């Protein structure tokens, strides 16, 4: 059927009164202070917020009016987003949203989404099967918004997105959609040519923000069968006839394009900064918890700096095509200066954690596993530390010494297990096991 | 068909196994410290036992190029053997490689010394190494090998190197509480001096304990590993029994010559493995009457009676032979008349278990 | 008359997974989610996968509840290797799963009395095996241990039930967290700044669709509104007593009788 | 109605379940560190076994692609504080060279623990997915008892031949699913006059002495080696010395 983003409901929000609803683009547009974005997938929430931020940038570029805070958005944005009704369309005879040149290669709808397993080099998955169950229109839209932000490598032959492998994504958060849009508003002089227009002209480099935030690395056509589904069995909400498959090709991202994502975190050498999460506890890695500590040095130095607000971090850990884990976190912040070397030390806690794991009970060799019982109590102490991450980051009354003493009781009760003797030497070696703590390192 | 060996062995003050710091191996069992002998030490002592020279047929070495070069009086080929091994998957003088000795000698001499191609010669060497699994020590101990996929060429394929182990050995835990002891040794200077001091001062660590040893042999897996030659399987079983009864681990035996022989061996024939170490969960305390071997044998007989009167199958009777030198230590001293065939000779015991295995005599099977 | 039903959630391990887990890393939340306790009650009644969907969720979901955390269990990560294929091939699936170790929870659901009575009756008679969120986590204490009662608010119900000491000399939390569904108060009344979102309102359960909800935490202080209980048992075994005496009067009569 | 099986099994020093770094699997209970065997480890050990292989049986007992299997097992929490140990191994080059030692020269991990193992079966749903075959369900429950009585986790056992048998099994037919893990909030301290298994079984007995004060119980120990409750008190309905008659009594109670 004819589907439009403007009138048909595709956004999952919860109202501040407490009623969750699927609503359209106009409803989340002109309310903007009674609802909060509510998506089960955190990076779905971030991609929808990125789309709304890009729409606000387009509205400002065509109206020149800032969104003042504590008061909903300007009312001149709705007629500018309304008169192009055929424009944000998934159907119809004309331009289509996030769709491109003609296609031949066909892939299932399961790979557009990332959270549901896809057709791997296997046959069995997490109880999914391609070409049998499909996603709804809202799920298809939220999967299409995942393309410019969270597209990974497809085996070193298929290229990544416009911001390389999907890095850490950091932004400013508030209890309202008005505060959602206002706290992440900082624009640039050149906007760019976004992909909800037609085939954009490449011309020169330095696209800006609006062209780079909405870059399309994939395509979608989908072949519509005669009728369709009767009852949904993939999304969870029982809906009408749904999709079955799609058609995806790739576009080679060219060389150069000196460009910085406003929300991305970039290393010292300019490469993307990744989420350090993997279940594979290797020789050089010790699995602890969500790595909120990692994207802190670059974001608090270059893009955003110290600023009063909430820091929402989204981390999609990946290694080539292996979708490892997605997590999000909220950090309070006031902007009370910035200590350089301490925040740099905090920027890599995994090194000190792995170093503390690799230290053996008694021994000197360095390729040993160290103490594997410590590796099961580092996660709980890391989870206890991660609650006061704002006070850790700004260093008001929380520091490295004040937080790594939260390992103490777990260390005592692991040392009870590792030295299960009531002797003098066992007690002394237990006490030496007590004082083990992650000495910080300079890089 | 599982052959189960439960041995009770009292040892003189000795240090058969030691850890990094030169202490006897200790493990917690039943909440108390027990002297431990590693299963790998027992397996090595069995494989290097005097009852195994006519049966030992496997080498586990990383210096394979040395072995291949040793069958060449004048044909100097060591760098090319190292290169073909490096391309085979080993990364260096290699990783540890286990296979037969006559196989590596003859086949590697006729394969890698031949002036021929290079990649397919490595494939031939890999096939020779993987397929050389016809050795009863390899059949008992088991082996699988994985070469480095980085240094290996993409044109070399490896077949299945997984040899399933037909032998399970438990760590020999003491029947009583562990008694770690310290030996204060000096080393006198053979030339005199003005000071009269030792050349070296140290502390050795030793322990005397009554160990419980446990072995399990899978007959079907043993004849699957060694293929249809069942004569070699019976020879392997007899050689294992003789070696386990008559060989001790070669620890500090030059300083602690503890070559005591086991006072009790139970050889049981059953389809499910039983650990009788739960007999010694309660530590054995000495008393005025009887000795430690008698007390341990009594506790073991109590648990054997409890297991037979407990876990019992009418479809598969439990049956085993009890060993004591000239019937010195009986098993069921009070009531447990379970051992039907108390046997007072090792050769008689080997003959009886070989007869239960099938139509095999020890002299007939000592020819493979 | 009793408008509150109580659930006791205690086991060796427990895992109420959060929203950010259906990948191979499958973490847990610090408190029992609403979908978890709702599923426990659904098993206690014993309806099917879709019978929960067919008009059973909002009857149990409009029951604004609270969860009271007695002691904080620590987060233990288990290294779970799924065999995948053991049509089949030698590939091993890798996973790490989070569990709450040594934690006790009390869940108070407030609703109309007849639903509470039916819930307690089905809790005493679980037609299916119930557990602590994951099937490998059976409860160590009865889920129907604490009897239902009538209470006006969630706070009174969650402060009435005492805190049970497992043994005689154990450190008890001086401060005790409580996490409740956000009471809207009057009509309107947009949620306060401390109201966090939680995607644990079930509306379909195969596949699981979760709706967001507003979740607010208060703190309780033991000794003034939460009171401890007695030990009600013995911990150690201590086998029976030897060392008969030689001066008691019951000894001499038997001694003279044997003579 | 629910059949609950609480098994106490003392294992000789071994490594039955390995984590990522090779350690024995470890849990946290009673305010102390315990040795753990994962539930899926015991599940796969009971499954795929010729001891157990001797509408579809064993699909209902352990599920395969909304089966909701009748039998599930808890993680094996030890009754005492875990005692993990380093074993140091070397692998000889067994070819005469100028040096010595060639292998990994590494370290393995092992632990000995007395595990409490909980099993729960629902009878009614086990009949339900068996399409009303009550006799087949009774036979497969007896087969579960036979297997789980004499199957161990087939972990690292070639170098650690741990084939110990359980010294105590308690089977009840109670109303609500309860685990007796709370019995071992006390880690078992070993005394001179009693062993670890006797003290663990005594802790279980002193805990089932409660609960009833504020159902039945079949107790199995091999030839009455460990009696549940060292008194004449009505704590165990039937002290059973052999596993076959235990299975027979349970089956004739059920049907
Ligand atoms: Mg959906």
Automatic annotation (TrEMBL), chain A:
Zn(2+) binds at residues 139, 232, 235. Mg(2+) 3 binds at residue 232. The chain holds residues 80 to 522 of 535 of the full protein. Mg(2+) 2 binds at residues 139, 235. Keywords: Metal-binding, Zinc. The keyword Cell cycle does not apply. This is CRISPR-associated protein Cse1 (CRISPR_cse1). Mg(2+) 1 binds at residues 139, 232, 235. The keyword Hydrolase does not apply.
Automatic annotation (TrEMBL), chain C:
The keyword Zinc applies. This is CRISPR system Cascade subunit CasD. The chain holds residues 4 to 291 of 388 of the full protein. It comes from Candidatus Cloacimonetes bacterium ADurb.Bin088. It comes from the Bacteria. Coiled coil: none annotated. The keyword Metal-binding applies. Keywords: Metal-binding, Zinc.
From TrEMBL, chain D:
This is CRISPR system Cascade subunit CasC. The gene is casC. It comes from Candidatus Cloacimonetes bacterium ADurb.Bin088.
């Amino acid at each position: 059927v004819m589907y439009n983003l403007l009138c048909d409901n595709w956004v999952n929000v919860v109202y501040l009164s407490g009623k969750p609803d699927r609503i359209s683009l106009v409803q989340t547009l002109k309310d903007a202070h009674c609802l909060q974005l509510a998506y089960s997938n955190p990076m779905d929430r971030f991609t929808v917020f990125r789309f709304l931020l890009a729409l606000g940038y387009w509205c400002f570029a065509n109206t020149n009016v800032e969104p003042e805070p504590d008061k909903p958005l300007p009312v001149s944005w709705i007629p500018w987003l309304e008169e192009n009704k055929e424009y944000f369309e998934l159907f119809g005879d004309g331009k289509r949203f996030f769709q491109a040149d003609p296609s031949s290669r066909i892939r299932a709808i399961t790979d557009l989404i990332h959270e549901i397993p896809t057709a791997h080099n296997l046959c069995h998955f997490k109880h999914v099967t391609d070409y049998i169950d499909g996603l709804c229109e809202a799920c298809c839209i939220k999967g299409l918004l995942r393309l410019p932000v969270f597209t990974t490598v497809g085996g070193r032959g298929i290229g990544a997105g416009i911001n390389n492998t999907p890095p850490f994504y950091l932004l400013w958060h508030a209890n309202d959609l008005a505060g959602m849009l206002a706290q992440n508003w900082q624009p640039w002089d050149n906007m760019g040519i976004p992909a909800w227009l037609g085939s954009f002209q490449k011309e020169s480099r330095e696209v800006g923000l609006l062209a780079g935030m909405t870059w399309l690395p994939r395509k979608v056509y989908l072949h519509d069968p005669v009728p369709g589904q009767a009852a949904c069995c993939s999304c969870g909400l029982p809906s009408e006839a749904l999709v079955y498959s799609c058609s995806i090709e790739v576009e080679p991202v060219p060389k150069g394009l000196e460009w910085k994502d406003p929300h991305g975190v970039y290393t010292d050498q300019g490469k993307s900064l990744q989420s350090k999460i993997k279940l594979m506890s290797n020789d050089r890695y010790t699995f602890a918890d969500r790595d909120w500590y990692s994207p802190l040095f670059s974001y608090l130095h270059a893009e955003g700096n110290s600023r009063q607000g909430k820091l929402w971090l989204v981390g999609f850990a990946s290694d080539k095509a292996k979708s490892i884990d997605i997590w999000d976190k909220i950090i309070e912040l006031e902007g009370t200066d910035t200590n350089d070397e301490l925040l740099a030390q905090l920027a890599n806690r995994a090194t000190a954690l792995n170093a503390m794991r690799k230290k053996p009970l008694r021994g000197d060799f360095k390729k040993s596993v160290g103490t594997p019982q410590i590796a099961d109590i580092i996660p709980h102490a890391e989870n206890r530390i991660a609650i006061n991450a704002g006070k850790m980051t700004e260093n008001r009354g929380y520091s490295w010494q004040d937080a790594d003493t939260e390992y103490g009781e777990l260390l005592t009760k692991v040392a009870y297990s590792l030295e299960p003797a009531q002797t003098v030497d066992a007690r002394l070696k237990r006490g030496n096991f007590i004082s083990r703590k992650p000495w910080p390192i300079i890089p | 068909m599982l052959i189960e060996i439960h041995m009770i062995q009292n040892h003189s003050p000795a240090n058969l196994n030691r850890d990094d710091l030169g202490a006897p191996k200790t493990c917690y069992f039943g909440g108390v410290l027990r002297s431990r002998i590693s299963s790998q030490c027992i397996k090595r002592s069995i494989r290097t036992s005097n009852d195994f020279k006519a049966l030992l047929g496997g080498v586990r070495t990383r210096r394979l190029a040395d072995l291949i070069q040793q069958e060449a009086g004048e044909t100097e080929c060591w760098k090319k053997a190292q290169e073909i091994l490096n391309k085979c998957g080993f990364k260096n003088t290699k990783m540890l490689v286990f296979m037969s000795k006559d196989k590596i000698k003859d086949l590697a001499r006729i394969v890698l010394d031949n002036s021929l191609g290079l990649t397919e010669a490595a494939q031939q060497v890999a096939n020779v190494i993987a397929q050389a699994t016809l050795a009863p020590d390899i059949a008992l101990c088991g082996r699988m090998l994985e070469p480095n996929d980085k240094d290996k060429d993409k044109k070399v394929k490896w077949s299945n190197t997984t040899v399933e182990a037909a032998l399970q050995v438990a760590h020999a835990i003491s029947t009583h509480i562990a008694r770690p002891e310290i030996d204060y040794f000096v080393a006198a200077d053979d030339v005199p001096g003005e000071d009269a001091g030792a050349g070296h001062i140290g502390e050795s660590m030793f322990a005397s304990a009554c160990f419980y040893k446990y072995f399990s042999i899978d007959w079907e897996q043993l004849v699957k590993n060694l293929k249809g030659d069942t004569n070699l399987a019976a020879h392997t079983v007899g050689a294992f029994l003789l070696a386990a009864a008559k060989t001790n681990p070669s620890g500090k035996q030059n300083s602690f010559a503890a070559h005591n022989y086991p006072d009790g061996i139970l050889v049981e024939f059953k389809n499910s493995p039983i650990s009788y170490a739960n007999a010694f969960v309660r530590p054995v305390s000495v008393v005025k009457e009887s000795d430690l071997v008698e007390q341990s044998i009594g506790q073991l007989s109590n648990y054997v009676n409890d297991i037979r009167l407990g876990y019992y199958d009418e479809q598969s009777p439990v049956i085993g032979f009890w060993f004591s030198p000239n019937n010195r230590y009986p098993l069921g001293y009070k009531h447990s008349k379970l051992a039907s065939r108390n046997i007072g000779n090792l050769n008689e015991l080997v003959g009886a278990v070989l007869d239960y295995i099938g139509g095999f005599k020890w002299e007939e099977v000592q020819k493979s | 008359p009793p408008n509150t039903l109580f659930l006791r959630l205690e086991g060796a391990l427990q895992s109420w997974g959060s929203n950010e887990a259906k990948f191979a890393l499958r973490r847990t939340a610090d408190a029992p989610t609403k979908s978890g306790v709702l599923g426990l009650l659904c098993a206690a009644m014993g309806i099917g996968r879709a019978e929960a969907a067919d008009s059973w969720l909002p009857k149990l979901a409009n029951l604004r509840m609270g969860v009271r955390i007695d002691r904080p269990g620590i987060r233990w990560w288990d290294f779970h290797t799924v065999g995948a294929g053991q049509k089949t091939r030698a590939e091993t699936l890798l996973s790490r799963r989070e569990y709450l170790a040594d934690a006790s929870f009390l869940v108070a659901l407030q609703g109309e009395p007849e639903l509470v009575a039916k819930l307690s009756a089905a809790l005493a008679k679980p037609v299916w095996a119930i557990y602590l969120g994951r099937k490998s986590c059976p409860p160590s204490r009865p889920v129907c241990e604490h009897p239902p009662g009538f209470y006006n608010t969630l706070e009174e119900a969650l402060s009435a039930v005492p805190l049970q000491k497992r043994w005689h000399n154990e450190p008890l939390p001086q401060i005790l967290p409580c996490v409740m569904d956000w009471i809207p108060g009057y009509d309107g009344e947009h949620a306060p700044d401390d109201a966090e979102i939680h995607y644990d309102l079930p509306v379909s359960f195969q596949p699981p669709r979760h709706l967001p909800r507003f979740v607010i935490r208060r703190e309780l202080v033991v000794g003034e509104d939460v009171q401890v209980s007695r030990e009600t048992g013995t911990s150690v075994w201590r086998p029976k007593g030897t060392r008969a005496d030689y001066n008691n009067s019951e000894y001499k009569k038997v001694r003279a009788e044997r003579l």
